[PDB]
Amino acid sequence: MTFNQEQDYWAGYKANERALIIQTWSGFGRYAPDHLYPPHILPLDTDNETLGTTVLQALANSRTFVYDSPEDQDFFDTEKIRQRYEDWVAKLCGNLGYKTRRALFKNMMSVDIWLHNGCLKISPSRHVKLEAWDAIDADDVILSLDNSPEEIGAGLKLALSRCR
Ligand code: NA
């Protein structure tokens, strides 16, 4: 896969009692889930090589906009974010057998992944609110593109174990 020097790539790795959910993020300056790319759902004991490869694929699709390009304005539009978010919730409930968003989110942990010049910053979080996650302290897993997909998968699972 093609990763460019100086370019930022972002992705997310969420997990609850039914699934792992890997998602491409996009943006400019700050990044967020990019619902242009559907979530990739995986079983909880997916092997490290599949988990690493899936997150690398998600990162490769991460878009960086030119500020105020039609793509940037659309991506950061308040109402479009809301509509795409609600569609994501409804679709994930359908794909995982949930009838309430309360149940979908109850045990959902979240890890963020940032790639830049070969460095992978894999960050755990605290599930602070029903549908939101905030950083915790000094718990990142730092890897790089030197690492095999399997080593990346191990570091992803490690970061998930650090979520609270
Ligand atoms: Na995500």
Tokens in use for 55?
């997150």
Q: Which residues 6+ apart lie within 8 Å of 80 measured at CB?
A: 74
Q: Which residues 6+ apart lie within 8 Å of 82 measured at CB?
A: none
Q: Which residues, in sequence order, are bridge partners of residue 27?
A: 31, 64
Q: Which residues 6+ apart lie within 8 Å of 54 measured at CB?
A: 22, 40, 42, 46
Task: Show me where the domains of the chain are located.
Answer: 2-164
Q: What is the CA radius of gyration of the chain?
A: 15
Farthest-apart Cα atoms in the chain, separation? 44
Q: How far apart are CA 130 and CA 56, in angstroms?
A: 28
Element (H, E) at 92: helix 78-96
Instruction: Give the pairing of strands 20-28 and 8-15.
Output: antiparallel
Number of H helices and E strands in the chain, helices first, is 5, 9
Separation of CA 126 and ligand 1 centre (Å): 14
Separation of CA 4 and ligand 1 centre (Å): 22
Query: What resolution in angstroms, rounded to 1 decimal?
Result: 1.4
Separation of CA 153 and ligand 1 centre (Å): 16
Q: Which residues, in sequence order, are bridge partners of residue 123?
A: 112
Separation of CA 69 and ligand 1 centre (Å): 24
C-alpha pair distances (Å), 18 with each of 63, 83, 131: 28, 25, 17
Closest CA to 159 of 11, 8, 3, 1: 11
Per DSSP, the three-state class of 76 is helix
C-alpha pair distances (Å), 67 with each of 32, 72, 94: 15, 6, 34
What method did the depositors use to determine the structure? X-ray
Angle CA(63)–CA(32)–CA(54) in degrees, nearest 5?
65
In terms of DSSP H, where are the helices of 106-148?
none
Separation of CA 131 and ligand 1 centre (Å): 11
- Which class is domain 2-164? alpha beta
For residue 121, the one-letter residue type is K
The angle that helices 48-60 and 149-161 make with each other, rounded to 10 degrees, is: 90
Question: Residue 38 has what DSSP assignment?
Answer: P
Q: Measured in Å, how far apart are the chain's first and last C-alpha atoms?
A: 32
Per DSSP, the three-state class of 99 is coil
